[PDB]
Structure 1
């Protein structure tokens, strides 16, 4: 009932908020905001103060149409941030990356969790993650960020997601990553149209059958934007609503831009579930 890494524990009996720290110039909602060290550190402290129990550090945007980032570039964006945070704060450090080198160097810098939207499918990533001994989040995606929003299609969405997770859990275990080190994310917005996203949100509780923690990320995405017809920074309410729905179905970790609001909503959820 707790996740663990390097002496840290995380309470999975109540919703946990993961604060998003983009260290990119081009992230869809906040590129260029926390792009440098003192600003990143400031934003992380703000999220911690607002009640985040994990900080997700990402140096590669993976939005629809996102450009490629070189190994060295991603390393330069990510590892000094991990290092500075690891030295200052008692909090879970998640690294949103798919690269083997970033996985390894971030682990050396003191990271706790590998958040890979590509589920360790890049060359060397599976072996690199294995050697870290750290927990790993596997995420469902149809296609790649360059083409995932070109005609998304499913015979049955939940069936595909289940098969994907079953296949990749097996890969991880065979590579020496214990099943209990794994987290599952059905990947909202990743090769899924508006209907798919809400179908998934409506059916989210079905994914508990794997008996692994669920992590979800809907914050400021087009699944909110397309319904409300508002820019990313004005999607806080819609994003919080999605968080509440997900958490009411027992999703354990919520990945968000707007930590304070999400934390406040999770309090209400927690009080409702425990009654």
Structure 2
């Protein structure tokens, strides 16, 4: 029995909620995932006088599955999954929700009961459901209305953006470096935020440290400021990216989490000093954390050669990993990062990159790869122009995506 399952969310970490739903389905032995749709963005469809608090942009998709679950049984499952993910199914109708799962279609089945109607009653009135459905089943008609060309119907409905964010194994982390103002204007950091979201960044990495020593106060205030602006723009954003804080200072981590933990997904450490206190902090806030190989080598003669680089990298990260684990932190919440720009010779960086899969395998941690615009990693001349850097970055990005590298950190998508 094939089904299309509609998935929607407009609260919490949106792409994560969707992924959790799909994983929960895929975990069932009596369900087979046939295909996942693209990601679609739309304004909350609301009743005419609903509180503006409910007006938060949606992320929608659908998945096609095969199952031995009969329709009523599958509905029970869907509710069970919404519950576990954290939805309040007695909450007011039309209100925001962490996850929503419905049966959009079941081939040409027509089922009409009070408790369950298939196809879903509103399928042909909702672009955020009909779009992903049509993406998955190209020639599909509502079985009651076989004469109705739903491609034209979808066009009539409009009001839907097909995002460039995807549900792929590899997510793109767009770089928001807050370290070009004019007489009356300083929104370049905002204009670049849009460029990232539009081009498909699933995550954004916000940092105020430069790659000149800057105070805790300055760093924090720069972060705090962008995050206040992010918050003011949240509800209308066509896609709400996961947020990573890019910093090496414990105090900054603490202050910023204390104030904005609700909207932060990940801490991306630039230098894993005081791993013990940081571990305690990651445990307290339950965020993702990225271990980087940055030993703070200041002498170029002492940079890592390639022949022992894999042992040097893994030994160090493993040691930091175990400390995190010993603080109760779930291994699945920890990522590693080679840190190409730190303490490594050119051929070493290139070498660590070529052997990235071996490293992930040995570390048993997911990988964050920061290759963007690094000549050494890209196998390019250091004095290469921005154009040749981004073209080499995109090509490498394609290869890492195919390798199912977990996160790639890039200046542009």
Report the TM-score when normalising by structure 2. Answer: 0.53
> Structure 1 residue 149: deviation in Å?
4.3
Distance in 2, Cα, partners of 1:148 & 1:242: 29
| Alpha-carbon distance change, 131 to 17 in structure 1, aligned in 2, over 3 angstroms | same
Paired position in structure 2 for 1:262? none
| Alpha-carbon distance change, 96 to 75 in structure 1, aligned in 2, over 3 angstroms | same
Distance in 2, Cα, partners of 1:149 & 1:58: 25
Paired position in structure 2 for 1:27? none
Task: Count matched residues.
Answer: 240
| Alpha-carbon distance change, 158 to 123 in structure 1, aligned in 2, over 3 angstroms | closer
Is 1:22 the counterpart of 2:177 in the alignment? Answer: yes
Q: Give 2:251's match in structure 1, choosing from 92, 101, 104.
A: 101
SS for the counterpart of 1:206 is helix
User: CA deviation digits over 1:72-125, x for unaligned, max 9?
Assistant: 010111111123224423210111011223212332222211000213537843
Q: Give 2:296's match in structure 1, choosing from 143, 147, 151.
A: 143
Distance in 2, Cα, partners of 1:54 & 1:149: 33
Paired position in structure 1 for 2:66? none
Q: Give 1:160's match in structure 2, choosing from 302, 308, 312.
A: 312
**Stretches of 4+ moved more than 6 A in 1?**
none
| Alpha-carbon distance change, 149 to 52 in structure 1, aligned in 2, over 3 angstroms | farther
Distance in 2, Cα, partners of 1:132 & 1:233: 40
SS for the counterpart of 1:48 is helix
Distance in 2, Cα, partners of 1:191 & 1:149: 7
> Structure 1 residue 163: deviation in Å?
1.1
Q: Indicate if the aligned counterparts of 2:178 and 2:208 stay in contact, CA closer than 8 A.
A: yes
> Structure 1 residue 164: deviation in Å?
1.4
Paired position in structure 2 for 1:39? 188
Paired position in structure 2 for 1:51? 200
Paired position in structure 1 for 2:60? none
Distance in 2, Cα, partners of 1:39 & 1:106: 22
User: What 5-or-longer segments of structure 2 have no aligned partner?
Assistant: 1-11, 20-166, 235-239
Report the TM-score when normalising by structure 1. Answer: 0.77
Larger gyration radius, structure 1 or structure 2: 2
Q: Indicate if the aligned counterparts of 1:215 and 1:252 stay in contact, CA closer than 8 A.
A: yes
SS for the counterpart of 1:103 is helix
> Counterparts in 2 of 1:112-131, with a 5 A limit?
112-119=265-272, 121=274, 124-131=277-284
Q: Indicate if the aligned counterparts of 2:174 and 2:410 stay in contact, CA closer than 8 A.
A: yes
Distance in 2, Cα, partners of 1:7 & 1:55: 13
Is 1:240 the counterpart of 2:394 in the alignment? Answer: yes
Where relative contact order (Cα < 8 A, 6+ residues apart) is larger, the structure is 1
Distance in 1, Cα, partners of 2:271 & 2:332: 19
> Structure 1 residue 7: deviation in Å?
4.5
User: What 5-or-longer segments of structure 1 have no aligned partner?
Assistant: 1-5, 25-31, 260-275
Distance in 2, Cα, partners of 1:122 & 1:162: 16
SS for the counterpart of 1:235 is helix
| Alpha-carbon distance change, 9 to 173 in structure 1, aligned in 2, over 3 angstroms | farther
